[PDB]
Amino acid sequence: LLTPKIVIIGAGPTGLGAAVRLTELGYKNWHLYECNDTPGGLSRSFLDENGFTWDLGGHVIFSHYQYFDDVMDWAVQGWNVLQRESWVWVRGRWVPYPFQNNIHRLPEQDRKRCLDELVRSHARTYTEPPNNFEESFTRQFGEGIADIFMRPYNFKVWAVPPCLMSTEWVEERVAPVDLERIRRNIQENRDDLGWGPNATFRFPQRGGTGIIYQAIKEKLPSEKLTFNSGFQAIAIDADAKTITFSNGEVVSYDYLISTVPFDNLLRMTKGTGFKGYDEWPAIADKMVYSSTNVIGIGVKGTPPPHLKTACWLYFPEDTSPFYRATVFSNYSKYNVPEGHWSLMLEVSESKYKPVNHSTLIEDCIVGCLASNLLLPEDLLVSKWHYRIEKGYPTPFIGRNNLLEKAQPELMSRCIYSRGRFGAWRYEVGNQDHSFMQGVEAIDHVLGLATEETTVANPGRVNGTRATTHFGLL
Numbered sequence: 001l002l003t004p005k006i007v008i009i010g011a012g013p014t015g016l017g018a019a020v021r022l023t024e025l026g027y028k029n030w031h032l033y034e035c036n037d038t039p040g041g042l043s044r045s046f047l048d049e050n051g052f053t054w055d056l057g058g059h060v061i062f063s064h065y066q067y068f069d070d071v072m073d074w075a076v077q078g079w080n081v082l083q084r085e086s087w088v089w090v091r092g093r094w095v096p097y098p099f100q101n102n103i104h105r106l107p108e109q110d111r112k113r114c115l116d117e118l119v120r121s122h123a124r125t126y127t128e129p130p131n132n133f134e135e136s137f138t139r140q141f142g143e144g145i146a147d148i149f150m151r152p153y154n155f156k157v158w159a160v161p162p163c164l165m166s167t168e169w170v171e172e173r174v175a176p177v178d179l180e181r182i183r184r185n186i187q188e189n190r191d192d193l194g195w196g197p198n199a200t201f202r203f204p205q206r207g208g209t210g211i212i213y214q215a216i217k218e219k220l221p222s223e224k225l226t227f228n229s230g231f232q233a234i235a236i237d238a239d240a241k242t243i244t245f246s247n248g249e250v251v252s253y254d255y256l257i258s259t260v261p262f263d264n265l266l267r268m269t270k271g272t273g274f275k276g277y278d279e280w281p282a283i284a285d286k287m288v289y290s291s292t293n294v295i296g297i298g299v300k301g302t303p304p305p306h307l308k309t310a311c312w313l314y315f316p317e318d319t320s321p322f323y324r325a326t327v328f329s330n331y332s333k334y335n336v337p338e339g340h341w342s343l344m345l346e347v348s349e350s351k352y353k354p355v356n357h358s359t360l361i362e363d364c365i366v367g368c369l370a371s372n373l374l375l376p377e378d379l380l381v382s383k384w385h386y387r388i389e390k391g392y393p394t395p396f397i398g399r400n401n402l403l404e405k406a407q408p409e410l411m412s413r414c415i416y417s418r419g420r421f422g423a424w425r426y427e428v429g430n431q432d433h434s435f436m437q438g439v440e441a442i443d444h445v446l447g448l449a450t451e452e453t454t455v456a457n458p459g460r461v462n463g464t465r466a467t468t469h470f471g472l473l
């Protein structure tokens with residue numbers, strides 16, 4: 001029985017998600033193309049010349065779907081399960097994540113400022129909802145929390161002024177505060193712990209996050225996968241329904257599951273009969289994102305007592321260039337050579353926030369010294385660096401309207417643009433979301449489902465847990 005030809009571009013979690021579902025269904029007429037030598041995309045891991053494994057920034061596995069959990073169990077045996085121990089370095093103190101719920105750990109005067117400003121913003125009411133993320137967190141948390149944490153931290157990570165960001169992506173990312181709880185915490189010095197979908201997470205014992213997608217790759221039919229730099233897609237002809245690669249090859253498709261960046265897709269896709277086609281270049285120009293610099297510092301010995309069981313740490317202040325540090329050796333003993341530990345640092349970059357790359361590593365090290373991560377006597381054996389051009393899809397004001405101008409037109413022509421940058425929706429931008437966007441796209445294409453829940457209803461997916469199992473486990 002011959003079936004429509006499905007081509008997948010990209011072997012990150014989204015693409016592999018589509019491939020896995022097809023495999024589960026026993027579908028035969030499909031092929032996946034990837035221009036990297038290795039599966040995983042932004043979820044790959046790297047082994048440096050000194051024996052240190054690196055992820056591309058802190059990655060931890062936590063799932064909103066039974067399906068993805070099953071896939072993880074199926075792909076990888078040997079998981080470490082950890083309770084999140086995450087902190088914020090601010091005003092000379094270690095404050096438990098989330099900052100806003102734990103202001104009792106601030107020095108007295110900062111704590112008083114945070115509480116008082118929180119009381120004052122409770123006393124202020126408004127006719128209309130906030131127009132942007134900054135107005136939103138300022139009204140919600142008060143000027144104390146905003147000044148000490150929300151504003152400097154959010155610029156430091158997003159590399160975009162938060163006043164240019166929308167407000168509805170925050171549901172599972174920005175914890176709310178309760179004034180009565182906060183006052184009680186202050187009376188009792190009682191930490192407020194365990195908030196959020198990654199309060200518990202898991203991480204592979206060996207090979208970093210990338211081992212997951214390597215194992216997945218090895219489970220799929222090898223003949224249906226292509227990993228080669230010549231297979232970078234550089235033109236989509238939607239009339240002829242072909243994909244032209246950088247090596248000059250041309251292949252046809254009935255359906256295209258594209259996980260390349262949405263801006264890249266719009267600029268390389270040509271055809272007739274697309275409504276609004278002439279606007280595509282302006283749409284692509286308006287898609288806001290930040291780049292991500294990953295710096296891996298390998299250190300002799302063992303981490304200091306205050307970092308013994310730390311996971312990831314946040315740095316709102318200008319004494320460090322990185323917004324986050326991960327004690328990556330605490331996820332697995334095998335991420336480092338014996339007798340060492342490691343810090344994985346993240347520095348954002350954009351048009352609003354340029355980076356001097358020639359001084360970046362040394363600046364990170366100076367930042368570690370100033371932020372209680374390293375001491376002058378620490379011995380550094382590895383200084384790894386990796387720059388991601390497209391790191392975060394900014395939830396910028398106007399994003400949905402831009403997306404709605406092209407996405408339904410692409411889909412009506414059998415082109416499904418999905419994943420972290422394929423759909424450009426940060427709030428469903430993690431590994432489980434991405435993987436499931438691939439699974440769901442296949443379901444839609446094959447008529448098993450009438451809608452794609454994850455990419456279309458971020459609120460629904462993150463408010464519940466999907467219960468359906470993965471059959472190959």
Ligand SMILES: Cc1cc2c(cc1C)N(C[C@H](O)[C@H](O)[C@H](O)COP(=O)(O)OP(=O)(O)OC[C@H]1O[C@@H](n3cnc4c(N)ncnc43)[C@H](O)[C@@H]1O)c1[nH]c(=O)[nH]c(=O)c1N2
Nearest residue numbers: 010012013014041042057059060232233419420429430431
């Ligand atoms: C700093 C940082 C930190 C985190 C995370 C990201 C980043 C940058 N993530 C998000 C996670 O990385 C993400 O959800 C997935 O990698 C996205 O999956 P995709 O397949 O959508 O994109 P992704 O970028 O992964 O994959 C796309 C693939 O398509 C390929 N491609 C692009 N253009 C092509 C072309 N023209 N031709 C052929 N191939 C092409 C690329 O090479 C790439 O391999 C995360 N998630 C999580 O669950 N927990 C976490 O803690 C984190 N933390």
Ligand SMILES: O=c1ccn([C@@H]2O[C@H](COP(=O)(O)OP(=O)(O)O)[C@@H](O)[C@H]2O)c(=O)[nH]1
Nearest residue numbers: 088096097098099100154157173174175314
């Ligand atoms: O103590 C904190 C730390 C972070 N955030 C917010 O949570 C968002 C998500 O950050 P996180 O490290 O959860 O996600 P990631 O950067 O990995 O996408 C950030 O942009 C912050 O605005 C917060 O409200 N309180």
